[PDB]
Ligand binder design. Structure first.
Ligand code: CLA
Ligand code: CLA
Ligand code: CLA
Ligand code: CLA
Ligand code: CLA
Ligand code: CLA
Ligand code: CLA
Ligand code: CLA
Ligand SMILES: CC1=C(/C=C/C(C)=C/C=C/C(C)=C/C=C/C=C(C)/C=C/C=C(C)/C=C/C2=C(C)CCCC2(C)C)C(C)(C)CCC1
Ligand SMILES: CC1=C(C/C=C(\C)CCC[C@H](C)CCC[C@H](C)CCCC(C)C)C(=O)c2ccccc2C1=O
Ligand code: SF4
Ligand code: SF4
Ligand code: SF4
Lengths: 124, 147, 143, 47, 83, 740, 80
């Protein structure tokens, strides 16, 4: 009930509106793909930065990239677990059961794509 | 803890051959604190250090582990319910009134642990820390100088 | 009372800014409670969900997420100004249920109309031992 | 718009996604050690 | 402290300017306070033969302010090489 | 408008109320029937807001209680001066302050405790004191024990005067409510006379007494050969040849030629190399400038002569657009509520004590103060703990004001109402930042411990593996080291030696040396920030949720100090604001314990030590750069490497410390069952004991009861804090006396 | 929900109802006491178990009793 200039700014509302989570109309698989791409791309960084084999040249990038891909896989598994636990029973289609399942599939696809993109970007 | 302190110190002094040390040192509690708790902990805490590592590194680690679980038992024992219930209420408001994270919601409402549950969890952490700490100290002291 | 009053959502809310201890997502999913009263003059009171508000001269309507907040506001208004308010409970489907003055004379009085329920006609300590009621689903105090 | 739509078509369903993530995790975990380790000089199979 | 010394001259000029200021506007006296400016006010303290409001507390306060302004200006000029 | 308002003889000076213990409250006026009454008699004894609803009588009681506390403090100070006068070796210490330990307590030989009278030096036997009173008396120009005797007699006289003042201003001439409510007059008089005039008087004492005596002491002459301070006061020849500017005789002050006073009003930063303390002329010019600034500040508020500012007008004028009514009702709050003023005073006094601890470990403002490592450590720790207790009591009395003295009629859209209106956001963000700080500090420590135990020294967050160097602190240190170079050109040296520079040593021991900040320093500083953040979260949650919450909407009607609201709503134990303060007391204890542990290890490893021809050899050899990054390092290289003196103190003069150490552990254990358990178990055990005493007809007429839940929590936190503080006190003092 | 049981030892002093923060108790006419009042609990599903009614009971032992168990949204005092 307590509106703030932070939570009611037009710029903040427009920045939240065009995000894949709060998009007006977009199929949930595309939202999952964008979510996975962005979050895998940011997650690959800390894994290649200060991993267990950071001092080893060449091995650091591949080890961090597979660590990020594995973490993306666990995140997709937990996303599917949330979808099965919360939406088992019965107007936004993403919050539906099969919509959230398609979102999870798009999320793991986008996460693998983002990990591969981070690999091919840090290789060059 | 008292019976195991007595057994451990008497047997350690017997194995070292300095039974007179236990005879003239178990009389006063400073002897218990110094000649048993402080003297025999030198090899335990030196399991890992910036200098290196000996075979008792795992015992030092689980000794600190036991002290930490004892501390978490204190965490669950001193405070009882109401602060945690109000804190969880504030966290519920924070989660409900934020963008990009209010889409995912809990199926079961987060609540503070019950007072009986508080006593049980504090007792469990206390006992686990007690057991792990004394097992670490006992095994490390009896194995660092004997075989 | 003589006739149970009906909740009017069009009654004006008291003068108040933004609220933080107010309605959560439980209001739009489960029941939420609504307290109404009839202020004879303009005065400042303290809400149980935050700071201070000013009630308008006339009908005043407030919304809370808990019945305890409604009764706390009710007893604050009764002790401070002798206001005699009343609160309803509104479910998710819109069902309105009358809660506090069930006979309209407040539970401190009797009204000679209520029926005493959940009352044991024996003294406390005369209940049977838990061995007497075992594997039956009945507690010693429920008989 | 054709891309990223049929990519998840065979994995959108809950059973297929769960089976795929379980198979991939088990395969990566089994590859770890005898194939994942001992190639990046991991200090557990050296001695 | 010397009679006719430049430090004494500038601090005496500052004190005299501060004294003559509140006699006609500018500085906040007892009868002129406001937030940014001068606004009319009471007297309370008798001025003891002084026209308008120029009582003993006024001359005490403004003499203290003038002495302080003078010593501050003198020491600031002495720090930068002037008088 | 502002005038003295005093009622003549409102309370008769009689002993009729001393016979009846419970008389201030109607609940205890009926006499005792259970034992908790006794505890209530010792609980609501000074809760004057509960005894009467009249603010005038409460203000009179507060005035008289302050007079009593001042009399108690003056009695304690007179006792300190008397102990320095008779049972001390201050005269022997003045000859060689670098070889005789300061001692001012002598015990009676009764049961073998005469071994506590250790060989401190100078042909004296006693307890080595760490209060630094010797350095304070050396800074004050005190030479003989006659001056200490006279100071003790004057302190006793002033304490008797303060007690008489309390009795008089309560029973005989009690000030009215309008007298206390003159906040402008109080502020003006306190800024001009209590602080400004006191600073001017101390500056005059330093200029006319302390500076010549300290100069002659640093010159190396005998203390008995030093002329008495009145000889410096009256005859101008000695002060003239000691300081040539005194030959002018107050001419440069009135002629504005203050630069001629540069000989005895200096700005030489750093420490005096003769004694390792702050320059006395620097302190004299400092207190003179402080006196002038406070004299200026004391003529700000309008009282009776038109000119001056108005506190209410200033508060009401400062209103921004994002805050609604800007500081509107706070003037009426702070002129009617004693507890809000108590909260503000306690917060600022605790913060001031923290600044005092930091700024006298940094600059020792006393001759031969830095050489005594034990005195510096004890003073730092003591001021630290006093500040922590005061800032806890600040939140406590703020919560008391919120429960009792808060009025929603006067607070509709002001700052306090808006803080209450977004308290949930405040507490949630504070909780989040507390969790983030705890993770990224303590998890860093656990990470270092694990990767040390896993054989990965290159994976640690240490000074050699992963450098998380404090770049901001290092930059500030470099800037303040160059502060006299460009930004303060009139300062001869740096304001302190902690930033950088050479090493000042006195008597072969390091007085002050530059302090290097590394990865361990960043880790412990962020740990301290996390602990302070959590304590702030606890106290702010207690203050803001003292009146109401979604869990409990009528918490204001339950009072400030209630145990619980029953097991309802899943359980509502420790939901009161008092219980929040009780919980935050332990967090304050943990925070300051870690702070003083960091202080002790840092000065023992990188500051204190001895100076040889090869270089500076510290006490612990500088292990803080390599051992303070792990919890095991704190266990072994700080807690086990030290505390060997405490356990081996037996048979020496330090043994009582070890005794206290063991006793402290006992008290720290003895609190736990007051902190654990409840009341029903002890009540049933007391019932069984009552049956036992009833069988023998020795049951008391006053019914014994178990302690209250709030009472049990208070007893537990008090014994826990006492045990922990005494443990740290004994361990610190024994370690710093045996090897310091 | 919790179970609130009221026995015949109640004197009809209406203290338990006044101390109730959720309007669970009520007073009904009776003949077993001088005040001709007896406590009743017709709204026991709204009780949280705070035991404030037991604190206000003036009779020895307790004429009103609260037994915890089977916590719900209303019994747990949750606003969410
Ligand atoms: C007993 C259970 C267990 C086991 C077997 C492991 C095993 C491992 N953990 Mg550990 N860990 C555990 C419990 C366990 N963890 C717990 C309980 C905690 C929390 C206290 C941690 C916290 C922890 C941290 C913080 C880190 C590890 C790391 C590691 C690795 C050690 C270094 C290494 O071999 O790099 C081998 C590296 C590889 C890339 C080889 C492949 C193995 C990967 C990691 C698994 C597969 C990835 C995933 C499925 C996505 C892949 C998708 C696709 C490419 C197939 C190793 C795989 C480190 C690590 O993996 O670095 C990121 C590390 O930094 N662990
Ligand atoms: C910051 C301080 C601190 C704190 C709070 C703790 C906390 C703990 N330590 Mg640790 N410790 C620390 C610092 C600390 N440690 C340091 C710096 C060292 C040196 C490296 C140690 C060395 C150490 C050892 C060697 C042991 C602990 C143990 C313990 C646990 C105490 C269990 C208990 O309640 O026993 C209750 C108290 C007792 C059982 C007796 C207290 C000791 C007395 C003096 C022995 C004599 C008793 C004798 C029977 C006579 C007494 C009878 C009585 C009637 C008078 C707990 C996890 C012990 C543990 O893990 O569990 C057993 C253990 O064995 N610690
Ligand atoms: C004619 C105008 C004039 C001039 C040229 C000066 C010049 C000076 N005064 Mg002065 N002053 C004046 C009027 C003037 N003053 C008046 C009217 C007053 C009364 C309000 C003062 C009160 C005053 C004080 C109280 C002090 C000076 C000081 C100084 C010196 C400035 C050094 C400084 O602060 O570093 C420059 C500092 C900064 C750029 C920033 C520092 C701010 C931090 C945060 C504090 C310099 C010699 C200081 C001094 O003694 O230095 C020799 C000093 O302590 N003056
Ligand atoms: C410039 C004048 C002046 C001075 C120096 C003081 C000094 C003091 N006041 Mg006071 N005050 C003043 C004017 C002054 N007051 C006025 C005008 C009012 C009314 C608006 C008040 C109202 C007031 C209240 C309500 C309270 C104080 C308190 C205090 C004490 C604060 C504690 C402290 O710092 O310990 C410093 C301690 C010492 C330096 C020890 C020596 C103290 C000596 C005996 C006092 C000498 C100053 C005294 C004012 C001289 C006049 C008294 C005369 C009739 C004999 C301190 C003694 C507090 C208190 O009661 O403390 C007892 C308190 O609660 N003041
Ligand atoms: C509160 C602080 C304080 C005090 C008490 C003094 C006091 C003194 N200083 Mg110091 N001084 C101070 C601050 C102070 N100063 C500061 C801040 C500076 C700046 C750095 C100096 C700089 C300074 C210098 C450079 C010199 C002094 C000197 C002096 C002496 C000269 C006295 C004088 O002319 O004053 C004026 C004093 C009076 C007018 C006396 C007061 C009026 C009396 C008490 C009236 C009594 C009437 C009574 C009711 C009737 C008799 C009663 C009887 C019948 C019982 C005196 C001992 C000089 C010195 O030592 O030479 C002797 C000297 O050379 N001082
Ligand atoms: C400026 C200082 C100051 C002042 C004037 C007050 C004044 C007040 N406080 Mg506050 N308080 C302060 C500081 C202050 N407090 C600080 C620093 C803390 C933090 C610890 C608190 C914490 C606090 C709480 C939590 C409460 C108060 C309460 C009160 C009120 C009554 C206190 C009473 O009757 O105690 C009577 C005196 C005692 C009970 C004796 C206390 C003795 C302690 C517990 C142990 C002594 C330790 C000792 C050093 C070691 C002994 C060892 C042994 C071997 C001898 C009163 C309004 C209470 C209240 O009702 O407020 C309205 C209340 O609930 N205060
Ligand atoms: C040393 C003992 C100890 C410890 C560690 C804790 C820990 C905690 N208490 Mg507590 N506290 C204690 C004693 C302790 N308590 C006692 C005795 C009291 C009574 C006065 C309190 C009073 C108290 C209050 C009043 C509050 C806390 C809060 C907290 C939290 C601190 C905030 C934070 O960043 O935590 C981070 C977590 C830790 C530091 C725990 C260790 C984490 C390690 C590094 C593991 C890292 C993750 C790990 C790898 C994952 C494991 C995987 C596994 C599952 C397989 C945390 C849950 C506050 C809270 O709720 O949050 C702000 C709070 O408000 N406590
Ligand atoms: C961690 C914070 C910190 C601390 C404790 C210090 C401390 C110090 N610095 Mg440093 N400084 C800092 C950060 C800090 N600095 C950051 C920078 C980069 C911009 C600098 C740049 C810097 C320079 C360039 C110099 C110093 C110097 C100094 C010294 C004197 C400064 C002084 O006069 O302050 C003022 C002293 C006071 C006692 C004022 C305190 C006033 C109190 C707290 C109330 C304030 C209320 C406030 C006015 C209200 C807010 C108003 C706001 C709403 C507008 C002192 C050792 C000087 C030096 O070398 O030492 C001689 C110097 O030349 N500092
Ligand atoms: C016209 C006229 C006249 C005249 C008048 C006059 C001429 C006046 C003047 C006046 C004046 C001319 C005054 C003055 C005053 C002053 C003062 C009052 C001062 C003070 C001071 C002070 C207070 C100081 C301080 C300080 C110090 C010491 C230290 C630090 C710094 C300072 C500076 C701050 C006659 C009467 C004939 C007649 C009528 C008309
Ligand atoms: C032990 C305990 C009790 C029982 C303790 C009680 C009732 C207090 C006992 C105080 C005694 C009487 C103090 C005096 C002790 C000695 C008789 C005095 C010293 C005698 C020598 C000088 C000879 C509680 O009541 C309680 C309540 C709430 C939480 C925790 C606890 C708790 O832990
Ligand atoms: S009686 Fe004790 S255990 Fe029960 S709610 Fe109160 S404080 Fe908690
Ligand atoms: S408080 Fe007890 S005696 Fe009084 S009306 Fe309620 S049940 Fe009866
Ligand atoms: S426990 Fe509380 S809510 Fe339940 S009937 Fe008693 S007073 Fe009412």
């Amino acid at each position: 009930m307590l509106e703030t200039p932070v939570t009611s700014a037009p710029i903040v509302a427009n920045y939240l509106s065009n995000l894949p989570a709060y998009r007006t109309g977009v199929a949930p698989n595309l939202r999952g793909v964008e979510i996975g791409l962005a979050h895998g791309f940011l997650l690959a960084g800390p894994f290649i930065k200060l991993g267990p084999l950071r001092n080893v040249p060449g091995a650091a990038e591949v080890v961090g990239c597979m660590s990020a891909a594995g973490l993306v896989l666990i995140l997709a598994l937990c996303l599917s677990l949330y979808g099965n636990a919360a939406f088992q029973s019965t107007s936004d289609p993403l919050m539906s059961s099969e919509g959230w399942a398609k979102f999870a599939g798009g999320f793991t696809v986008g996460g693998l794509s983002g990990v591969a993109w981070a690999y091919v970007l840090t290789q060059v | 803890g008292w019976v195991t302190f007595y057994w451990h110190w008497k047997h350690l002094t017997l194995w070292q051959g300095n039974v007179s040390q236990f005879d003239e040192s178990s009389t006063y509690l400073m002897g218990w604190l110094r000649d048993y708790l402080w003297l025999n902990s030198s090899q335990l805490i030196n399991g890992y250090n910036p200098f290196g590592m000996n075979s008792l590194s795992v015992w030092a680690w689980t000794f600190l582990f036991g002290h930490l679980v004892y501390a978490t038992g204190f965490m669950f024992l001193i405070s009882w319910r109401g602060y945690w219930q109000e804190l969880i209420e504030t966290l519920v408001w924070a989660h409900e009134k934020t963008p990009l994270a209010n889409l995912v919601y809990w199926k079961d409402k987060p609540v503070a642990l019950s007072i009986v549950q508080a006593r049980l969890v504090g007792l469990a952490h206390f006992s686990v820390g007690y057991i792990f700490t004394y097992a670490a100290f006992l095994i490390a002291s009896t194995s660092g100088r004997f075989g | 009372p003589w006739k149970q009053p009906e909740l009017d959502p069009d009654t004006p809310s008291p003068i108040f800014g933004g609220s933080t201890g107010g309605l959560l997502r439980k209001a739009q999913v489960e029941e939420f409670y609504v307290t109404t009263w009839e202020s004879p003059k303009e005065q400042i009171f303290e809400m149980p969900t935050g700071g201070a508000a000013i009630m308008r001269k006339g009908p005043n309507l407030l919304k809370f997420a808990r019945k305890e907040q409604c009764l706390a506001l009710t007893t604050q208004l009764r002790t401070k100004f002798k206001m005699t308010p009343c609160f309803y409970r509104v479910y998710a489907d819109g069902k309105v249920e009358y809660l506090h003055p069930k006979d309209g004379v407040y539970p401190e009085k009797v009204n000679a109309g209520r029926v005493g329920v959940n009352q044991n006609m024996r003294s406390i300590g005369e209940n049977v031992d838990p061995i007497k009621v075992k594997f039956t689903g009945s507690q010693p105090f429920t008989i | 718009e054709e891309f990223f739509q049929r990519a998840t078509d065979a994995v959108s369903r809950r059973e297929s996604l769960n089976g795929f993530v379980a198979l991939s995790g088990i395969a990566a975990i089994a590859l770890f050690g005898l194939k994942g380790a001992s190639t990046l000089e991991l200090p557990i199979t050296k001695g | 402290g010397f009679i006719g010394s430049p430090t004494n001259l500038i601090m005496v000029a500052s004190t005299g300017a501060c004294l003559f200021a509140s006699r006609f506007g500018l500085a906040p006296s007892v009868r002129k306070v406001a937030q940014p400016l001068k606004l009319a006010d009471r007297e309370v303290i008798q001025t003891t033969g002084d026209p308008a409001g120029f009582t003993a507390t006024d001359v005490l306060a403004m003499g203290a302010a003038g002495h302080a302004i003078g010593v501050g200006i003198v020491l600031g000029l002495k720090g930068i090489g002037q008088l | 408008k502002v005038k003295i308002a005093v009622d003549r003889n409102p309370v008769e000076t009689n002993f009729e109320k001393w016979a009846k213990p419970g008389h201030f409250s109607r609940a205890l006026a009926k006499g005792p029937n259970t034992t908790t009454w006794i505890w209530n008699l010792h609980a609501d004894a000074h809760d004057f807001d509960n005894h009467t609803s009249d603010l005038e009588e409460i203000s009179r009681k507060v005035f008289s209680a302050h007079f009593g506390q001042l009399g108690i403090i003056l009695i304690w100070l007179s006792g300190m001066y008397f102990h320095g006068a008779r049972f001390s070796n201050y005269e022997g210490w003045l000859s060689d302050p670098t070889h005789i330990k300061p001692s001012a307590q002598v015990v009676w030989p009764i049961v073998g405790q005469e071994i506590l009278n250790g060989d401190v030096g100078g042909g004296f036997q006693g307890i080595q004191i760490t209060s630094g009173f010797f350095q304070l008396w050396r800074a004050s120009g005190i030479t003989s024990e006659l001056q200490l005797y006279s100071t003790a007699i004057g302190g006793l006289v002033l304490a008797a005067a303060c007690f008489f003042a309390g009795w008089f201003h309560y029973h005989k001439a009690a000030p009215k409510l309008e007298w206390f409510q003159n906040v402008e007059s109080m502020l003006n008089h306190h800024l001009a006379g209590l602080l400004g005039l006191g600073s001017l008087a101390w500056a005059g004492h330093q200029i006319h007494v302390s500076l010549p005596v300290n100069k002659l002491l640093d010159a190396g002459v005998d203390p008995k050969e030093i002329p008495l301070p009145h000889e410096f006061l009256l005859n101008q020849s000695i002060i003239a040849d000691l300081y040539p500017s005194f030959s002018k005789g107050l001419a440069p002050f009135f002629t504005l030629n203050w630069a001629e006073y540069s000989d005895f009003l200096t700005f030489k930063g750093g420490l005096n190399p003769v004694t390792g303390g702050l320059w006395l002329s620097d302190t004299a010019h400092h207190h003179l400038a402080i006196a002038v600034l406070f004299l200026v500040a004391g003529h700000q508020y309008r009282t009776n002569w038109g000119i001056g500012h108005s506190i209410k007008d200033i508060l009401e004028s400062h209103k921004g657009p994002f805050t609604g009514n800007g500081h509107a009702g706070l003037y009426e709050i702070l002129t009617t509520s004693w507890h809000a003023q108590l909260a503000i005073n306690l917060a600022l006094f605790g913060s001031l004590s923290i600044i005092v601890a930091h700024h006298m470990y940094a600059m020792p403002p006393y001759p031969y103060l830095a050489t005594d490592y034990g005195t510096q450590l004890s003073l730092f720790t003591h001021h630290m703990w006093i500040g922590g207790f005061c800032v806890v009591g600040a939140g406590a009395h703020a919560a008391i004001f919120m429960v009792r003295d808060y009025d929603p009629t006067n607070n509709y859209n002001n700052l306090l109402d808006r803080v209450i209106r977004h308290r949930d956001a405040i507490i949630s963000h504070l909780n989040w930042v507390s969790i983030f700080l705890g993770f990224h500090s303590f998890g860093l420590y656990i990470h270092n411990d694990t990767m040390s135990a896993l054989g990965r020294p290159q994976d640690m967050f240490s000074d050699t593996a992963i450098q998380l160097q404090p770049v901001f602190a290092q930059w500030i240190q470099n800037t303040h080291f160059t502060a006299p170079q460009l930004t303060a050109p009139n300062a001869l040296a740096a304001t302190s030696l902690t930033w950088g520079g050479d090493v000042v040593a006195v008597g072969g021991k390091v007085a002050m040396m530059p302090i290097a900040l590394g990865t361990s320093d960043f880790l412990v500083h962020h740990i301290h920030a996390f602990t302070i953040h959590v304590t702030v979260l606890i106290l702010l949650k207690g203050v803001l949720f003292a009146r109401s919450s979604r869990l409990i909407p009528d918490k204001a009607n339950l009072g400030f100090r209630f145990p619980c609201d029953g097991p309802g709503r899943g359980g509502t134990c420790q939901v009161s604001a008092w219980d929040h303060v009780f919980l935050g007391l332990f967090w304050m204890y943990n925070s300051l314990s870690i702070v003083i542990f960091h202080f002790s290890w840092k000065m023992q490893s990188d500051v204190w030590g001895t100076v040889t021809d090869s270089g500076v050899s510290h006490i612990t050899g500088g292990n803080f750069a390599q051992s303070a990054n792990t919890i095991n390092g704190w266990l072994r290289d700080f807690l086990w490497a030290q505390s060997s003196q405490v356990i081996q103190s037996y048979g020496s003069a330090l043994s009582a410390y070890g005794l206290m150490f063991l006793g402290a552990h006992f008290v720290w254990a003895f609190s736990l069952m007051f902190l654990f358990s409840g009341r029903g178990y002890w009540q049933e055990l007391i019932e069984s004991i009552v049956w036992a005493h009833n069988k023998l007809r020795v049951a008391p007429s006053i019914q014994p009861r178990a302690l209250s839940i709030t009472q049990g929590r208070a007893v537990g936190v008090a014994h826990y804090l006492l045990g922990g503080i005494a443990t740290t006190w004994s361990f610190f003092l024994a370690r710093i006396i045996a090897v310091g | 929900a919790h179970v609130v049981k009221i026995y015949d030892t109640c004197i009809g002093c209406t203290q338990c109802v006044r101390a109730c923060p959720l309007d669970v108790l009520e007073m009904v006419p009776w003949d077993g006491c001088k005040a001709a009042q007896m406590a009743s609990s017709p709204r026991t599903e709204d009780c949280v178990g705070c035991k404030r009614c037991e604190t206000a009971c003036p009779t020895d032992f307790l004429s009103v009793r609260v037994y915890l168990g089977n916590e719900s949204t209303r019994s747990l005092g949750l606003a969410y």
